[PDB]
Amino acid sequence: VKPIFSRDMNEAKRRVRELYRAWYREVPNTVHLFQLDISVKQGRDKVREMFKKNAHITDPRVVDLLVIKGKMELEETIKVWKQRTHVMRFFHETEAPRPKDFLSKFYVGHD
Amino acid sequence: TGLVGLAVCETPHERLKILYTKILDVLGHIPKNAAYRKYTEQITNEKLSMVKAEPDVKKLEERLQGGQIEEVILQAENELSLARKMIQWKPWEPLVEEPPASQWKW
């Protein structure tokens, strides 16, 4: 039984859920205490898209490592640390290129 | 008189003899065939005889310490904790664990 990591395959699914609950309650608290920034409604959708990219589930070792990493980048506002409105902003604001078209990307000349 | 460390050098003889006699009994519980018991005993028996021979002189403190009796007592105070931890976690008596992948050369 190597290596433990933290929990078994089925138990790892509910560890992320426990992390999700604590972070779901922080998005109304990161507006009033910190800064206005964007919105409460748009902030919650920014959380959901982060977990969808990480969604694979094949090994308990990979899932449990994401929990500990999640208990630092999302713990940055739990005990209230300084981010100065530059950190914690995960989504790009000044980055506007999203081209996925053989026709679109080739016109801009890339790769 | 004052010691170098934070722990004050209290005037107590035979105090060092108590802790060294305690650890000898702890070693003779689980490991007997293992080398951990056989090798630690010969250091302690040699050290205990030096305390019995010297009558409260600084030369007794100069025997493999040379920082007064207080510094030697700290090594004896943590000796019981490490001996109990060695008996609790099986490592000295048992040897059956797996070996790593054959690679070492850089």
Binding site: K2, P3, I4, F5, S6, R61, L65, I68, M72, E73, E76, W81, Q83, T85, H86, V87, M88, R89, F90, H92, E93, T94, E95 | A34, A35, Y36, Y39, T40, I43, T44, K47, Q65, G67, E71, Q75, N78, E79, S81, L82, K85, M86, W89, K90, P91, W92, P94, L95, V96, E97, E98, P99, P100, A101, Q103, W104, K105
Partner: protein, 206 residues
């Protein structure tokens, strides 16, 4: 030799006795490989038990090291097991230096040195930041040498020197400093590698 040799070996025979002394205990749980070269000693330890090895060398009557001052980690992708945590130890009463190593891939959690040593926890934070090696039963695993919103681990050989997110413009936004810009100035990759092996005996058979 006048300027050819640095120092003559005389204490090397006495230091070789240490390599036998710990090996005389003979655990498959601990010992494995003992290497000693250039007035120093190196021991590598099986991942399952590291804490019982750290309690040893500390306190012990014959070898009283106690101070586990320096704590390093190696980044190497040649082996099947990647990272290698290396402990550097020093004795103040005995006056000697010994080395403790780990061999596991350590992407999976490894045993912590916080119950044994009080300053090791700060060095443990350095390993998790730079490499990504989690320590089990560690009190407060905070980030030190990494950014507050940093993805990945900044030291790994698998990713570039310049980094993914590194460039920070002020631009059109009034206060928010940018991150997503990734282009930097060209670091010249030197493809230099001299023919012929410089040293004998270091050559390994295929």
């Amino acid at each position: 030799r006048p300027t050819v040799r640095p120092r003559n070996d005389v204490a090397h025979k006495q230091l070789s006795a240490f390599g036998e002394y710990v090996a005389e205990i003979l655990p498959k749980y601990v010992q494995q490989v003992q290497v000693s070269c250039f007035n120093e000693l190196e021991i590598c330890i099986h991942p399952d038990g590291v804490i019982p090895v750290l309690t040893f060398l500390r306190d012990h009557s014959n070898a009283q090291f106690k101070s586990l001052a320096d704590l390093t980690a190696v980044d190497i992708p040649t082996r099947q097991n990647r990272f290698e945590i290396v402990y550097n130890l020093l004795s103040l009463r005995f006056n000697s230096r010994i080395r403790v190593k780990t061999y596991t891939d350590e992407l999976t959690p490894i045993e912590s040195s916080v119950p044994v040593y009080k300053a090791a926890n700060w060095y443990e934070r350095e390993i998790w930041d730079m490499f990504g090696v989690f320590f089990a039963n560690h009190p407060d695993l905070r980030r030190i040498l990494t950014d507050y919103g940093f993805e990945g681990h900044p030291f790994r050989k698998d990713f570039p020197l310049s980094g993914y997110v590194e460039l920070r413009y002020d631009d059109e936004v009034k206060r928010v400093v940018a991150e997503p810009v990734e282009l930097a100035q060209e670091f010249r990759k030197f493809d230099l590698n001299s023919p012929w092996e410089a040293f004998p005996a270091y050559r390994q058979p295929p």
